[PDB]
Every structure is written in C-alpha cells, then in structure tokens.
Amino acid sequence: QTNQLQYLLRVVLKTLWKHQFAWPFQQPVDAVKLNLPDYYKIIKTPMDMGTIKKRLENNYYWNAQECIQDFNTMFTNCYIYNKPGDDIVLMAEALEKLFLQKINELPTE
Amino acid sequence: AKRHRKVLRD
C-alpha cells in the first residue's frame, strides 16, 4: 500500500499537521507539563501525529491500514480520556472530520 | 481530564 502510505504522508498527515488545531497532537501528550497524573495509566497506547510522521518517514509501516490504525488510536485516546465540550475534544473532532474526509478519498491499491 | 483552554477567543 505504498501509494496509500504516500497518500497518508503527503495528503493526510500534511493537511492535518498544518491545521490550526494540530499543535496539541504534534507530539506525545506531556502528562508532566499538563498535570495529568493518570494519563499514562488510563491510556495504554499513547499515539500522536509526531510519532506517525516519524513512522511514515522512517519506513515503519508495512501497510496503510497500520497507519490509519495509529491515527484512530490517537483520536480514541483523546475521546476516552477527555471531558465532552473541552477545547481538546473540540480540536480532536475537527481534525478527525478532516482525517475521515481525506481517508474516504484514499487511492485504490 | 486535560481541561486546559487551547482554542483562541476574541
């Protein structure tokens, strides 16, 4: 799924990364800085777009599904850990929508 | 549980 992994890097990641709401998702959740003592107990698989970018760039993925899985994990972590209405959740939701739009245009192969 | 304001307001 190299064409799809190219799509995930150059179209999907590129678009989300440049978004005004990307910045809390560009690096791993800083639970120290953010005073989230429980984060690294409740969240079993931390994920962020910074990590996904590195995976796309360093030939981590064997197929596009694994990458789409990572994006989903990142959004899920946000939705299972955060409070409905809070800015972080409103930000995750707008990114997820753009993500899903770009994923529905995923090139065949 | 990460309750910080993030989104700029006017």
Alpha carbon distance, N-terminus to C-terminus of chain B: 25
Residue B4 distance to chain A (closest CA, Å): 7
CA A31, CA A39: separation in Å to the nearest integer?
A: 6
Specify whether the CB–CB gap between A101 and A11 falls below 8 A: no
CA-nearest residue of chain B to A29? Answer: B2
CA-nearest residue of chain A to B3? Answer: A86
Write the single-letter amino acid at A45.
T
Specify whether the CB–CB gap between A19 and A94 falls below 8 A: yes
CA A101, CA A27: separation in Å to the nearest integer?
A: 23
Structure tokens of A38? 């429980």
Residues of A in contact with B9 (CB under 8 A): none
CA-nearest residue of chain B to A90? Answer: B7
Specify whether the CB–CB gap between A40 and A8 falls below 8 A: no
Specify whether the CB–CB gap between A48 and A74 falls below 8 A: yes
- What sign results for the dihedral spanned by CA atoms A60, A63, A68, A70? negative
* DSSP letter for each residue of B1-10: ------S---
Domain borders along chain A are 1-106
Residue A14 distance to chain B (closest CA, Å): 21
Residues of A in contact with B5 (CB under 8 A): 87
Structure tokens of A41? 């107990």
CA A104, CA A102: separation in Å to the nearest integer?
A: 6
| Other beta carbons within 10 Å of A91 | 21
Q: With an 8 Å Cβ cutoff, are A87 and B7 in contact?
A: yes
CA A74, CA A89: separation in Å to the nearest integer?
A: 12
Q: With an 8 Å Cβ cutoff, are B2 and A91 in contact?
A: no
Resolution reading in Å: 2.0
Short-list A13, B6, B8, A105, CA closest to A82: B6
The CATH number of the structural domain formed by A1-106 is 1.20.920.10
User: How distant, in Å, are the alpha carbons of A3, A16, B6 from that of A6?
Assistant: 5, 15, 31
